[PDB]
Coordinates of C-alpha atoms and ligand atoms in Angstrom, one line a residue:
Chain A
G70 CA -47.3 14.8 111.5
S71 CA -45.5 11.9 109.4
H72 CA -42.2 13.8 109.8
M73 CA -38.9 12.1 108.5
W74 CA -35.6 11.5 109.7
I75 CA -32.7 11.1 107.1
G76 CA -29.4 10.2 108.4
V77 CA -26.5 10.7 105.7
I78 CA -22.9 9.5 105.7
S79 CA -20.6 11.9 104.0
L80 CA -17.0 13.3 103.7
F81 CA -18.8 16.6 102.7
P82 CA -21.6 17.4 105.1
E83 CA -21.6 20.9 104.3
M84 CA -22.7 20.1 100.7
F85 CA -26.3 19.5 102.4
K86 CA -26.8 22.9 103.4
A87 CA -27.8 23.2 99.8
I88 CA -31.0 21.5 100.7
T89 CA -31.2 22.1 104.4
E90 CA -31.2 26.0 104.4
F91 CA -33.0 27.1 101.3
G92 CA -36.4 26.9 99.6
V93 CA -39.3 24.4 100.4
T94 CA -36.8 21.7 101.9
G95 CA -35.2 24.3 103.9
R96 CA -38.7 25.3 105.3
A97 CA -39.2 21.8 106.2
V98 CA -36.1 21.5 108.1
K99 CA -36.8 24.6 110.0
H100 CA -40.3 23.5 110.7
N101 CA -39.1 20.0 111.9
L102 CA -41.0 18.3 109.4
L103 CA -37.7 16.9 108.0
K104 CA -34.4 16.2 109.9
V105 CA -31.2 15.5 108.2
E106 CA -28.3 14.4 110.4
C107 CA -24.8 13.8 108.8
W108 CA -22.0 11.5 110.0
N109 CA -18.3 12.2 108.3
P110 CA -16.0 9.2 108.3
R111 CA -13.3 11.7 108.7
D112 CA -14.4 11.9 112.2
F113 CA -14.0 8.3 112.9
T114 CA -10.1 8.1 111.6
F115 CA -7.4 7.7 114.1
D116 CA -4.2 8.3 112.2
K117 CA -2.6 11.6 112.3
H118 CA -3.7 12.7 108.6
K119 CA -7.5 11.5 108.9
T120 CA -7.0 9.0 106.2
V121 CA -10.2 8.2 104.5
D122 CA -9.4 6.5 101.4
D123 CA -7.3 3.1 100.4
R124 CA -5.9 1.0 97.7
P125 CA -7.8 -1.2 95.8
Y126 CA -6.7 -4.8 95.8
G127 CA -6.1 -6.0 92.2
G128 CA -4.6 -2.7 91.7
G129 CA -5.8 -0.3 88.7
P130 CA -5.9 3.6 89.3
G131 CA -8.1 5.3 91.9
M132 CA -8.8 4.7 95.4
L133 CA -11.7 3.5 97.6
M134 CA -13.4 4.7 100.4
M135 CA -11.3 3.3 103.7
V136 CA -13.4 0.5 105.2
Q137 CA -13.0 1.4 108.9
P138 CA -13.8 5.0 109.2
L139 CA -16.7 4.4 106.9
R140 CA -17.9 1.2 108.6
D141 CA -17.8 2.9 112.2
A142 CA -19.8 6.1 110.8
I143 CA -22.5 3.8 109.3
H144 CA -22.6 1.8 112.7
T145 CA -22.9 5.2 114.7
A146 CA -25.6 6.5 112.2
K147 CA -27.6 3.2 112.9
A148 CA -27.4 3.3 116.4
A149 CA -28.9 7.0 116.6
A150 CA -31.6 5.9 114.1
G151 CA -32.7 3.1 116.4
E152 CA -34.9 0.6 114.8
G153 CA -36.4 0.6 111.2
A154 CA -33.9 2.6 109.4
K155 CA -33.4 1.6 105.7
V156 CA -29.8 2.1 104.7
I157 CA -29.4 3.0 101.1
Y158 CA -26.2 3.1 99.0
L159 CA -26.4 5.5 95.9
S160 CA -24.5 4.4 92.7
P161 CA -24.8 3.9 89.2
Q162 CA -25.5 0.2 90.0
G163 CA -28.7 0.6 91.9
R164 CA -32.1 0.4 91.1
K165 CA -33.1 3.3 88.9
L166 CA -35.2 5.9 90.6
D167 CA -38.5 6.8 89.2
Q168 CA -41.5 8.6 90.7
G169 CA -42.9 5.4 91.8
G170 CA -39.7 4.6 93.5
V171 CA -39.6 8.0 95.2
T172 CA -43.2 7.3 96.7
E173 CA -41.9 3.6 98.0
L174 CA -38.9 5.2 99.6
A175 CA -41.0 7.9 101.1
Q176 CA -43.1 5.3 103.2
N177 CA -40.3 5.0 105.3
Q178 CA -40.1 7.1 108.6
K179 CA -36.0 6.8 108.7
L180 CA -33.5 6.3 106.2
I181 CA -29.5 6.5 106.0
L182 CA -28.0 7.4 102.9
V183 CA -24.5 6.5 102.2
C184 CA -22.6 8.8 100.0
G185 CA -19.3 7.5 98.4
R186 CA -16.4 9.5 97.1
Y187 CA -13.3 7.9 95.0
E188 CA -14.1 5.0 92.8
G189 CA -16.4 3.1 95.3
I190 CA -16.8 1.1 98.3
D191 CA -15.8 -2.1 99.6
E192 CA -18.3 -4.8 98.1
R193 CA -18.3 -6.4 101.7
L194 CA -19.6 -3.7 103.1
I195 CA -22.6 -3.2 100.6
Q196 CA -23.3 -6.8 101.4
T197 CA -23.2 -6.3 105.4
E198 CA -24.3 -3.2 105.8
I199 CA -26.6 -1.8 102.7
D200 CA -30.5 -2.9 102.5
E201 CA -30.9 -1.3 99.2
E202 CA -29.1 -0.1 96.2
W203 CA -30.6 3.2 94.1
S204 CA -29.3 5.0 91.3
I205 CA -30.8 8.7 90.5
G206 CA -30.0 7.8 86.7
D207 CA -27.8 6.2 84.1
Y208 CA -24.5 8.5 84.5
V209 CA -21.5 9.0 86.6
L210 CA -20.9 11.7 89.3
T211 CA -18.1 12.8 91.5
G212 CA -19.8 11.2 94.5
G213 CA -22.8 10.2 96.0
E214 CA -24.1 13.5 97.9
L215 CA -25.8 14.9 94.7
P216 CA -27.7 11.9 94.4
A217 CA -28.4 11.6 98.1
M218 CA -29.6 15.4 98.1
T219 CA -32.0 14.5 94.9
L220 CA -33.7 11.5 96.8
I221 CA -34.2 13.8 100.1
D222 CA -35.8 16.7 97.9
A223 CA -37.9 14.1 96.1
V224 CA -39.2 12.2 99.1
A225 CA -39.6 15.4 101.0
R226 CA -42.3 16.6 98.5
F227 CA -44.3 13.7 100.3
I228 CA -44.1 14.8 103.9
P229 CA -47.4 16.3 105.2
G230 CA -47.0 20.4 105.4
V231 CA -44.0 20.5 103.2
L232 CA -45.9 21.4 100.1
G233 CA -49.5 23.0 99.9
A234 CA -42.0 11.7 85.5
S235 CA -44.2 8.8 86.4
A236 CA -46.7 7.3 88.7
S237 CA -57.4 14.7 86.0
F238 CA -56.1 11.3 86.7
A239 CA -52.9 12.8 84.8
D240 CA -50.2 10.8 87.2
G241 CA -47.9 9.3 84.9
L242 CA -48.1 11.8 82.1
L243 CA -45.8 14.7 81.6
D244 CA -46.7 18.0 82.6
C245 CA -48.7 20.7 80.6
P246 CA -47.5 24.2 79.6
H247 CA -47.8 27.0 81.9
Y248 CA -48.5 30.6 81.3
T249 CA -48.4 33.8 83.2
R250 CA -48.2 37.5 82.6
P251 CA -48.0 39.3 80.3
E252 CA -50.8 38.4 77.7
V253 CA -48.5 38.7 75.0
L254 CA -44.8 38.0 75.0
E255 CA -42.5 38.5 71.8
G256 CA -45.8 38.1 69.7
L257 CA -46.6 35.2 71.3
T258 CA -50.1 34.9 72.9
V259 CA -51.4 33.3 76.0
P260 CA -54.1 30.2 74.7
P261 CA -57.5 31.8 74.9
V262 CA -59.2 28.9 77.0
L263 CA -57.0 29.9 79.7
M264 CA -58.8 33.3 79.8
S265 CA -62.0 31.6 79.4
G266 CA -62.8 31.4 82.8
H267 CA -64.1 28.0 82.0
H268 CA -62.9 25.6 84.2
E269 CA -64.1 22.6 82.7
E270 CA -62.4 23.3 79.4
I271 CA -59.4 24.5 81.1
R272 CA -59.0 21.3 82.7
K273 CA -59.5 19.2 79.6
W274 CA -56.9 21.7 77.6
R275 CA -54.4 20.9 80.3
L276 CA -55.2 17.0 80.2
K277 CA -54.9 17.0 76.5
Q278 CA -51.8 18.9 76.5
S279 CA -50.2 16.3 78.7
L280 CA -51.1 13.4 76.8
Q281 CA -49.9 15.2 73.5
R282 CA -46.8 16.2 75.1
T283 CA -46.2 12.7 76.6
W284 CA -47.3 11.0 73.3
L285 CA -44.4 13.3 71.3
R286 CA -41.7 13.2 73.8
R287 CA -41.9 9.9 75.6
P288 CA -44.3 7.6 74.0
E289 CA -43.2 4.8 75.8
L290 CA -44.6 6.2 79.1
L291 CA -48.1 6.0 77.5
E292 CA -47.8 2.3 77.3
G293 CA -47.4 1.7 80.8
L294 CA -50.7 3.4 81.5
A295 CA -54.3 2.4 81.5
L296 CA -55.8 5.6 79.8
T297 CA -59.3 6.7 81.3
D298 CA -62.1 7.0 78.3
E299 CA -61.7 10.6 78.7
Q300 CA -57.8 10.4 78.3
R301 CA -58.1 7.9 75.3
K302 CA -60.7 10.5 73.7
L303 CA -58.3 13.4 74.2
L304 CA -55.4 11.8 73.0
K305 CA -57.1 10.8 69.6
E306 CA -58.0 14.2 69.2
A307 CA -54.4 15.3 69.7
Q308 CA -53.2 12.9 67.2
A309 CA -55.9 13.7 64.9
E310 CA -54.9 17.3 65.0
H311 CA -51.1 16.5 64.7
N312 CA -52.2 14.4 61.8
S313 CA -54.1 17.3 60.1
Chain B
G280 CA -6.8 23.8 78.5
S281 CA -10.5 22.6 77.4
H282 CA -11.8 24.8 80.5
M283 CA -15.6 25.2 80.7
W284 CA -17.7 28.0 81.7
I285 CA -21.4 27.4 83.0
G286 CA -23.7 30.2 83.7
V287 CA -26.6 29.5 86.1
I288 CA -29.8 31.1 86.6
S289 CA -31.3 30.6 90.2
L290 CA -33.2 32.0 92.9
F291 CA -30.9 30.1 95.3
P292 CA -27.2 30.6 94.1
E293 CA -25.7 29.7 97.2
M294 CA -27.0 26.2 96.7
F295 CA -24.1 26.0 94.1
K296 CA -21.6 26.0 97.0
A297 CA -22.4 22.6 97.4
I298 CA -20.2 22.0 93.9
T299 CA -17.9 24.7 93.8
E300 CA -16.6 24.6 97.4
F301 CA -16.1 21.0 97.8
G302 CA -14.5 17.6 96.4
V303 CA -13.3 17.4 92.8
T304 CA -15.5 19.9 91.4
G305 CA -14.3 22.3 94.0
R306 CA -10.8 21.8 92.9
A307 CA -11.8 22.2 89.1
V308 CA -13.4 25.6 90.1
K309 CA -10.1 26.7 92.4
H310 CA -7.7 25.8 89.4
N311 CA -9.7 27.6 87.0
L312 CA -10.7 24.6 84.9
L313 CA -14.2 25.2 85.5
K314 CA -16.2 28.5 86.2
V315 CA -19.5 28.8 87.4
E316 CA -21.3 32.1 87.4
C317 CA -24.7 32.6 88.8
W318 CA -27.4 35.4 88.1
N319 CA -30.5 35.5 90.6
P320 CA -33.9 36.8 89.0
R321 CA -34.4 38.3 92.5
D322 CA -31.6 41.1 91.5
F323 CA -33.7 41.8 88.5
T324 CA -37.0 42.7 90.3
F325 CA -38.0 46.3 90.6
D326 CA -41.0 46.3 93.1
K327 CA -40.7 47.0 96.8
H328 CA -41.1 43.3 97.8
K329 CA -38.8 41.7 94.9
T330 CA -41.5 39.4 93.6
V331 CA -40.1 36.7 91.5
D332 CA -43.3 34.4 91.2
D333 CA -46.8 35.1 89.5
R334 CA -50.2 33.7 89.1
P335 CA -50.9 31.0 86.4
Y336 CA -53.5 32.1 83.7
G337 CA -56.2 29.6 84.0
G338 CA -55.9 29.3 87.6
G339 CA -55.1 26.2 89.6
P340 CA -53.1 26.1 92.7
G341 CA -49.4 27.2 92.6
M342 CA -47.5 29.8 91.2
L343 CA -44.9 30.3 88.3
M344 CA -41.8 32.0 87.9
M345 CA -42.4 35.6 87.1
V346 CA -41.6 36.3 83.7
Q347 CA -39.7 39.7 83.7
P348 CA -37.1 39.2 86.6
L349 CA -36.3 35.6 84.9
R350 CA -36.2 37.0 81.4
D351 CA -34.1 39.8 82.1
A352 CA -31.7 37.1 84.2
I353 CA -31.4 35.2 81.2
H354 CA -30.4 38.1 78.7
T355 CA -28.1 39.3 81.3
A356 CA -26.3 35.8 81.4
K357 CA -26.5 35.4 77.5
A358 CA -24.8 38.6 77.0
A359 CA -21.8 37.8 79.5
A360 CA -21.4 34.2 77.9
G361 CA -20.7 35.8 74.5
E362 CA -21.5 33.7 71.5
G363 CA -22.2 30.1 71.4
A364 CA -23.6 29.5 74.6
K365 CA -26.2 26.7 74.7
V366 CA -29.1 27.5 77.0
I367 CA -30.6 24.7 79.0
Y368 CA -33.9 24.2 80.9
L369 CA -34.0 21.6 83.6
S370 CA -37.3 19.7 84.0
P371 CA -39.1 16.3 83.6
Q372 CA -40.3 16.9 80.6
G373 CA -36.8 17.4 79.0
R374 CA -34.8 14.7 77.5
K375 CA -33.5 12.2 80.0
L376 CA -30.1 12.6 80.8
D377 CA -27.6 9.3 80.5
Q378 CA -23.7 9.1 80.4
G379 CA -24.1 9.5 76.3
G380 CA -26.2 12.7 77.0
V381 CA -23.4 14.1 79.4
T382 CA -20.6 13.3 76.9
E383 CA -22.7 15.4 74.2
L384 CA -23.1 18.2 76.6
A385 CA -19.7 18.2 77.6
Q386 CA -18.6 19.2 73.7
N387 CA -19.9 22.8 74.9
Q388 CA -17.4 25.3 76.0
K389 CA -20.4 27.6 77.5
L390 CA -23.5 26.4 79.0
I391 CA -26.2 28.2 80.5
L392 CA -28.7 26.4 82.9
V393 CA -32.0 27.9 83.5
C394 CA -33.1 26.8 87.3
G395 CA -36.9 27.0 87.9
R396 CA -38.8 27.1 91.3
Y397 CA -42.6 27.1 92.0
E398 CA -44.7 25.0 89.4
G399 CA -42.5 26.2 86.2
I400 CA -42.0 28.7 83.8
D401 CA -43.9 30.5 81.1
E402 CA -44.1 28.1 78.0
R403 CA -43.2 31.2 76.0
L404 CA -40.0 31.7 77.7
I405 CA -39.1 28.3 76.7
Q406 CA -39.8 28.9 73.2
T407 CA -38.1 32.0 72.7
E408 CA -35.0 31.6 75.3
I409 CA -34.2 27.8 75.6
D410 CA -32.0 26.0 73.2
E411 CA -32.4 22.4 74.9
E412 CA -34.6 20.8 77.3
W413 CA -33.2 18.1 79.6
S414 CA -34.2 15.9 82.6
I415 CA -32.1 14.2 85.0
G416 CA -34.6 11.5 85.7
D417 CA -38.3 10.6 85.7
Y418 CA -39.0 12.1 89.1
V419 CA -40.3 15.6 90.5
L420 CA -38.2 17.8 92.7
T421 CA -38.7 21.3 94.3
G422 CA -36.5 23.1 92.2
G423 CA -34.0 22.9 89.0
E424 CA -31.0 23.5 91.2
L425 CA -29.9 20.0 92.1
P426 CA -30.6 18.8 88.4
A427 CA -28.5 21.8 87.4
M428 CA -25.5 20.8 90.1
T429 CA -25.9 17.0 88.9
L430 CA -25.3 18.1 85.2
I431 CA -22.4 20.2 85.8
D432 CA -20.6 17.5 88.1
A433 CA -21.4 14.9 85.4
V434 CA -19.8 17.3 82.6
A435 CA -17.0 18.2 84.9
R436 CA -15.6 15.2 84.7
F437 CA -14.6 15.4 81.0
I438 CA -12.8 18.6 81.8
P439 CA -8.8 17.6 81.1
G440 CA -7.3 17.9 84.7
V441 CA -10.4 17.5 86.5
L442 CA -9.7 13.7 87.1
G443 CA -6.6 11.7 86.9
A444 CA -24.5 4.3 83.5
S445 CA -23.7 3.8 79.7
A446 CA -21.8 4.8 76.6
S447 CA -11.7 -3.6 78.7
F448 CA -14.0 -1.9 76.3
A449 CA -16.3 -1.9 79.3
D450 CA -18.1 1.3 78.4
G451 CA -21.8 0.8 78.7
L452 CA -21.7 -1.9 81.3
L453 CA -22.3 -1.6 85.3
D454 CA -19.3 -1.2 87.3
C455 CA -17.5 -4.3 89.0
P456 CA -17.1 -4.8 92.5
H457 CA -14.3 -3.3 94.4
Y458 CA -12.2 -4.3 97.4
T459 CA -9.9 -2.9 99.7
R460 CA -8.4 -3.6 103.2
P461 CA -8.8 -5.8 105.4
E462 CA -8.2 -9.0 103.7
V463 CA -11.2 -10.5 105.8
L464 CA -14.2 -8.5 106.7
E465 CA -17.0 -10.0 108.7
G466 CA -16.0 -13.5 107.6
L467 CA -15.9 -12.3 103.8
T468 CA -12.7 -12.7 102.0
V469 CA -11.4 -10.8 99.0
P470 CA -11.4 -13.0 95.8
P471 CA -8.0 -14.8 95.6
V472 CA -7.7 -13.5 91.9
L473 CA -7.3 -9.9 93.1
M474 CA -4.4 -11.1 95.2
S475 CA -2.7 -13.1 92.5
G476 CA -0.9 -10.3 91.1
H477 CA -2.0 -11.6 87.5
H478 CA -2.9 -8.3 85.7
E479 CA -4.9 -10.1 82.7
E480 CA -6.6 -12.7 85.1
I481 CA -7.7 -9.6 87.2
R482 CA -8.8 -7.4 84.1
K483 CA -10.9 -10.7 82.8
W484 CA -12.4 -10.9 86.2
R485 CA -13.1 -7.5 86.3
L486 CA -14.9 -7.3 82.9
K487 CA -16.6 -10.6 83.5
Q488 CA -18.0 -9.3 86.7
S489 CA -19.3 -6.1 85.0
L490 CA -20.7 -8.3 82.4
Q491 CA -22.7 -10.7 84.8
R492 CA -23.9 -7.5 87.0
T493 CA -25.4 -5.8 83.8
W494 CA -27.2 -8.8 82.7
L495 CA -28.6 -9.6 86.4
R496 CA -29.5 -6.0 87.2
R497 CA -30.1 -4.4 83.8
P498 CA -30.4 -6.8 80.8
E499 CA -31.6 -4.1 78.7
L500 CA -28.5 -2.4 78.4
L501 CA -26.8 -5.2 77.1
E502 CA -29.0 -5.3 74.3
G503 CA -27.6 -1.8 73.4
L504 CA -24.2 -3.0 73.0
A505 CA -22.1 -5.0 70.3
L506 CA -20.1 -7.2 72.5
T507 CA -16.6 -8.0 71.6
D508 CA -15.7 -11.6 71.1
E509 CA -14.0 -11.6 74.5
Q510 CA -17.2 -10.2 76.1
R511 CA -19.3 -12.5 74.5
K512 CA -17.1 -15.4 75.9
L513 CA -17.1 -14.1 79.6
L514 CA -20.9 -13.2 79.4
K515 CA -21.6 -16.8 78.2
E516 CA -19.2 -18.2 81.0
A517 CA -21.0 -16.2 83.9
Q518 CA -24.4 -17.2 82.5
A519 CA -23.3 -20.9 82.7
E520 CA -22.0 -20.4 86.2
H521 CA -25.4 -18.7 87.2
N522 CA -27.2 -21.7 85.6
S523 CA -25.1 -24.2 87.4
Ligands
4GZ32 C1 -21.3 2.5 85.1 C2 -20.3 2.7 85.9 C3 -18.8 2.9 85.2 C4 -17.9 3.0 85.9 C5 -17.9 3.5 87.2 C6 -19.0 3.6 87.8 C7 -19.2 3.9 89.4 O1 -20.1 3.7 90.1 N1 -18.3 4.8 89.5 C8 -18.1 5.3 91.1 C9 -19.1 6.5 91.5 C10 -19.5 6.7 92.9 C11 -19.9 7.8 93.1 N2 -20.6 8.7 91.9 C12 -22.0 8.4 91.7 C13 -23.1 7.9 92.6 C14 -24.4 7.8 92.3 C15 -24.5 7.9 91.0 C16 -26.1 7.8 90.6 N3 -26.2 7.6 89.3 O2 -26.9 7.6 91.3 C17 -23.6 8.4 90.0 N4 -22.4 8.7 90.2 C18 -18.2 6.3 93.6 C19 -18.5 6.6 95.0 C20 -19.6 5.4 95.5 C21 -20.7 5.5 94.6 C22 -20.4 5.6 93.3 C23 -20.1 3.4 87.2
4GZ33 C1 -44.1 15.0 85.1 C2 -44.7 16.2 86.1 C3 -45.9 16.2 86.8 C4 -46.1 17.2 87.5 C5 -45.3 18.4 87.5 C6 -44.1 18.2 86.9 C7 -43.1 19.6 87.0 O1 -42.5 19.7 85.9 N1 -43.2 20.3 88.0 C8 -42.2 21.4 88.1 C9 -41.0 21.1 88.5 C10 -39.9 22.0 88.1 C11 -38.5 22.2 89.2 N2 -38.6 20.6 89.5 C12 -37.8 19.8 89.0 C13 -36.8 20.1 87.9 C14 -36.1 19.5 87.2 C15 -36.3 17.7 87.2 C16 -35.5 16.7 86.5 N3 -36.1 15.5 86.7 O2 -34.6 17.1 85.8 C17 -37.0 17.4 88.4 N4 -37.9 18.4 89.1 C18 -40.5 23.5 88.3 C19 -39.2 24.7 88.0 C20 -39.2 24.3 86.5 C21 -38.6 23.1 86.3 C22 -39.6 21.9 86.9 C23 -43.8 17.3 86.0

């Protein structure tokens, strides 16, 4: 159905095996629901030593991605993608990814993800080749590959058939606690409601737990929500119990 | 020197090749600055079909990590780590990772990272086995492996010898623009200051650019900082120019 194609520009394409060969995403690739295609700037070099880095104007330590091999790799990916491919640059300077952002990105049938190494890429390439800049969080990594892989995994969950944070009606809340066998573990028992077989009591317990957990751990997330009448009631109950 | 050991619990240990075999982190592993050791709950199963999932109490769709194989894997990792290993569970319900959090985690000589699959792990395991809960961002992935890999990469940058977001004195600000060859690219020129050879003008330009970029893209980050006199001045200059 709404299958997705993701082009990747990376000096380390074999890193992407972590998502293309394993788990739910691996199955998505095998079943042709998701296609990940990689281009390596090293393949676009022409000097004997296949140089992919270059010195920064203005000095300072560190190197940057060499423009020519990276530019040529991007152009080749764009040509293969055809029309409509959104080109994304992953860096801490980008729009912070959240679940709403994931759902926006998942609307695209084609994406090209540019993964930098070293200290960065030329600002003029960002101006001329990149459509959107995204960050997976406020921290610094050794390359854009893990961020790209994270984005791919997050959007892959929205492709029909692949499956069986933020935005019942619990979208926007933290997940509730989960329990499986055994009934008693290190003296700790499963909440009896979960054994009751009472589907409505269980639903309300889970929703109440999610509201309580969000209130205690991430109260700022609650402010972004328009709680339903039921959610307002269950949250009040949790707060009263917490205060008791 | 201050080398780091990271134990990992994962159903897909081969995913970790993405960080142990490539780039800066790959070199860190080869040079014994970083050691990543994996235990797979599947190896701790005893039934013919090596079952690693189990049904949730209370019903609902989805499965959870089976308790016994996961618990046994964790205990084995803890025994190997010896004393002082901090056990971390990666999920959206955890403390949000940022660069300050990375620096806190990097203080640990040993970490054990628990990577879940399916819909989660038993809440009582979180109570009894986990020291800290961390999230790499407000989005949902298919497993805890990419978050674990992200954390490892982020902390690896702090191990001496491995190298040559948030918290001069530019810590806390977004990165400045970078330029490399050629001097003119698609009609776009490198800022002349970067060619001036004037080290102090270049330093101030970069700092001003970082202040401007942080103000325009992430103004909330500026509020968390106590700007130096120089930073206050350069920010004012950037704001005046933006308003002109
Ligand atoms: C605030 C600050 C201060 C100092 C340097 C930087 C900086 O941007 N350094 C360059 C890092 C680099 C790759 N590493 C990444 C990529 C993406 C993400 C993410 N959070 O999505 C994290 N780290 C280099 C290759 C191009 C992309 C960026 C940022
Ligand atoms: C808000 C919300 C709503 C609904 C479900 C969940 C949920 O937690 N679902 C389970 C996901 C799972 C793995 N996926 C991950 C792991 C870590 C991260 C991260 N951001 O660090 C992201 N995704 C399952 C295995 C155990 C760990 C958690 C969360």
